[PDB]
Design a protein around this ligand. Structure first.
Ligand SMILES: CC(=O)NCc1cn[nH]c1
Lengths: 412, 412
């Protein structure tokens, strides 16, 4: 058998806000977090906008001295993690510290740090490389620093599965608790790839929307005018907890994590298969994992990245998995407002999926002015839709054809 | 309910050889793979030597056209993966492809590639960034490219837990099989951090041996004259397989994976606690996981990095876990010969642990001329030691206080 896993805490930095409730308020209002990127010369770049975290004060979390040691992506993961744990009311003790672990991930890691240390290296030589360069830049330091700050002695690791990281981190954390390896896990991802390398790298692959004139309209999933994804920064963390452990201490439970799917497309390095065969297997594996019929799904938070091939693959996949239920469920892309947080996309979108359950409302896909050929599902165009939601899926599909699906269910 | 997991295939690039047999011959002969680095000008650096992979021909594996797009760490991970799958004799079919996955990890990933594109960005501009920068550098693309080349549609992911990456990758892949999420996994790690940022970054932290005038004597675990670890490159991959699946197809089985342990130190970003309390918790979790008496442990493949604090912490941990049996078992560090392959360390060392079981021999700790205060166990100084090994244990410890232990035993 297998233990049940609930969500007792959530934390977040997004382009919509510095915590969950401010972000969610943005989501439900259909507000864009997308704007031209400030403090950074993007003159020579084909993209000049994205979703930045606005007004982030790391000294709410760390001393200036400790924060100087850590890439922005680590600072963002720590913010969300500290918010989630505090949100949970959990008390770490000598009696439970060994049963509390962390799996916070990143798709791309410490590009901003790598870039600033490259500056010093090329200009002045290696003796100007920071001593904290390595531990301050590597992806497992959100899990590392979090475990040290809070005395967490349970499983300590980090996933890096590109744009699937947040979904894989939360799902595998859920398994840890299910199979009795931990009672609590902090899980999710964080990302800050708005450097020359992030913007330039994705720009060189022409993966990015170049709609510089209207940044808030750039991210337009399933719209016939979409021209690639919008690069966004931030973090999501969830406190996952064994149900009996949660009930014993009188935890507030947001929702239950009932299902987790993984699959490989084995198709292409960056492009999904047109029929979304991969996303289809992943979702079926997730629903089998939950013991649920496709007919029981009410709400899907799409990957919905606003790439030509990605959006269409996901329509094909849902139609394949859900047959005559495909029009009944609501499916929206919150990336229409947040843009694409890469490795943190699945973390924030899991939180939005959980809040859709709490509040019985499907978030909008904004900018969906002219749905493309075959995009005739209920994609919650323009405005939040109040509706019945017992079961919510969150999908992530990343480079290497790596797929992730999470199934959350109302708890009561 | 929990299924058993065996090793049916192994693959490797190391500073001692371009495969497992060649590498293993060097280990038992006590040969060093450590030499001044030839691929760049290190005269401005305080460390000028490492374990390079010598004479790697990527066109034994991949088209020059595909190889040109990929960081060496990905080329190294693919090379070891292809070797391991060939060594397993497994045939991928429509019938089984959905039950075969991959978890190949890296500590740092595509740091050379990121440096090169960073140079292009700063010297020329964003328009000279490779269109393959992202899919050619990010850590999950060993798992991705492997899945694409062989058509593996099982769980597809990557860990990044610094110097623990290979041990965790293998351990968690076994759990995937144990719990029925897959019947087969290719798992391990790859690293190529021997660029300016890598040697400069570890150099800035004063973590590396500076013995530039005698590189083969640099890596000297538990020796009183040790002065840091030696940075080495390469890859380890294992085919892990549910026992009955292996039996059904008549697979040759090298050994059984009976035990996996994880723990966080929750101590320090980069330093281990002097008493090895985190390593001790991890090894105890792994032995309890294997259903063993600690006295069954015959051979330990130590982390054994040749750092002052790391080496002694591990003595403390082994004494605390094994009591008087700490004086009966044999413990060696193959890092004495290979150097520290970082995220690949746990992968090659898992392979050396399985070959200690096959060949009934403890690999030497070379350069152990003057064991330090309290380093009074059988550390197999200087020369391989033929002996009874029924149970072998492989330890890794990383930045963020992240610990991993694998337990393997003979299968008959
Ligand atoms: C330049 C050189 O080889 N010096 C000797 C040494 C011993 N430990 N670290 C350095």
């Amino acid at each position: 058998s297998r233990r049940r896993v609930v969500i007792t805490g959530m934390g977040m930095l997004s382009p919509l806000g510095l915590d969950v409730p401010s972000s969610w308020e943005g989501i439900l209002a259909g507000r864009s977090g997308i704007a031209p990127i400030e403090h950074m010369d993007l003159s020579a770049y084909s993209t000049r906008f994205g979703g930045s975290v606005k007004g982030f004060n790391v000294e709410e979390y760390l001393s200036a001295k400790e924060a100087r040691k850590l890439d922005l992506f680590i600072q963002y993961g720590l913010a969300a993690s500290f918010q989630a744990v505090r949100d949970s009311g959990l008390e770490v003790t000598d009696a439970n510290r060994e049963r509390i672990g962390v799996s916070m991930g990143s798709g791309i890691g410490g590009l901003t740090n790598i870039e600033n240390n490259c500056r010093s290296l090329f200009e002045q030589g290696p003796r100007r490389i920071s001593p904290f360069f390595v531990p301050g830049s590597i992806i497992n330091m959100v899990s590392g620093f979090l475990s040290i700050h809070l005395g967490l002695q349970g499983p300590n690791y980090a996933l890096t599965t590109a744009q699937t990281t947040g979904t894989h981190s939360i799902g595998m954390a859920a398994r840890n608790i299910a199979y009795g390896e931990a009672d609590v896990m902090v899980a999710g991802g964080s990302e800050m790839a708005a450097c020359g390398l992030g913007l330039g790298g994705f720009g060189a692959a022409r993966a990015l929307s170049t709609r510089n004139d209207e940044p808030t309209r750039a991210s337009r999933p399933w719209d016939r005018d979409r021209d690639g994804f919008v690069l966004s920064d931030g973090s999501g963390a969830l406190v996952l907890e064994e149900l009996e452990h949660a009930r014993a201490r009188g935890a507030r439970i947001y929702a239950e994590l009932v299902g987790f799917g993984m699959s490989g497309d084995a198709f292409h390095m960056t492009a999904p298969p047109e029929d979304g065969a991969g996303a289809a297997r992943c979702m079926k594996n997730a629903l089998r994992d939950a013991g649920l019929d496709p007919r029981q799904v009410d709400y899907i938070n799409a990957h919905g990245t606003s790439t030509p091939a990605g959006d269409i693959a996901e329509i094909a996949a849902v139609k394949s998995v859900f047959g005559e239920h495909a029009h009944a469920l609501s499916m929206s892309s919150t990336k229409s407002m947040t843009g694409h947080l890469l490795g943190a996309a699945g973390a924030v979108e899991a939180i939005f999926s959980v809040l859709a359950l709490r509040d019985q409302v499907a978030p909008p896909t904004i900018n969906l002015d002219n749905p493309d050929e075959g995009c005739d599902l209920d994609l919650v165009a323009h405005e939040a839709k109040p509706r019945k939601i017992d079961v919510a899926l969150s999908n992530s599909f990343g480079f290497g054809g790596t797929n992730g699906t999470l199934v959350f269910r109302r708890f009561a």
